[PDB]
Ligand binder design. Structure first.
Ligand SMILES: Cc1cc2nc3c(=O)[nH]c(=O)nc-3n(C[C@H](O)[C@H](O)[C@H](O)COP(=O)(O)O)c2cc1C
Length: 169
């Protein structure tokens, strides 16, 4: 597989999303699925295409496994990689920090030389602030299983379909 997906999760939602994205891409032969709790930052070097999934916890913080590796990301060579992101969040409970983690990771990784692809429009959501917004789009797939579970399936399907192109699929 030429695409590597690395996710982190506290309660399992992000994992489930990760599994669905893998299946939408076409399976294990298309995307390698990895829990970041088991990886080294160095594992990220193998791929030209990455998908980073991370939920936001504790009012605007990264999920703990991502927080653990955060400082090691500098050691990865992201030059030339295309990276797409996804995150789980709750726009009602955390309106002022909706999907911040996705935003924090994207800012770090993009600054290291990768190109973000996979922007997602903000129509259909309601939140006050987010670190993951740029030019009025999310930098990646914003999922909200707490408030909008009925939208998830479609959001994933649409997003993957847009991604396919950018990943040379
Ligand atoms: C105590 C607590 C704090 C949270 N903080 C945030 C937050 O700052 N921003 C946000 O978008 N969602 C926040 N969430 C919502 C979660 O990210 C969300 O429930 C997600 O589905 C959890 O994903 P996981 O199972 O992969 O960890 C919080 C949830 C809890 C329970």
């Amino acid at each position: 597989a030429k695409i590597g997906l690395f996710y982190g999760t506290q309660t399992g939602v992000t994992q489930t999303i990760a599994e669905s994205i893998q299946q939408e891409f076409g399976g294990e032969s298309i995307v390698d699925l990895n829990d970041i709790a088991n990886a080294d930052a160095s594992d990220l070097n193998a791929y030209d295409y990455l998908i980073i999934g991370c939920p936001t916890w504790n009012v605007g913080e990264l999920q703990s496994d991502w927080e653990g590796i955060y400082d090691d990301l500098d050691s990865v060579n992201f030059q030339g990689k295309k990276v797409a992101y996804f995150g789980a969040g709750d726009q009602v409970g955390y309106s002022d920090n909706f999907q911040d983690a996705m935003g924090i990771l994207e800012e770090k990784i993009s600054s290291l030389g990768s190109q973000t692809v996979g922007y997602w429009p903000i129509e259909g959501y309601d939140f006050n602030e987010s670190k993951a917004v740029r030019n009025n789009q999310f930098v990646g797939l914003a999922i909200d299983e707490d408030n909008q579970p009925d939208l998830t399936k479609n959001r994933i399907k649409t997003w993957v379909s847009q991604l396919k192109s950018e990943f040379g699929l």
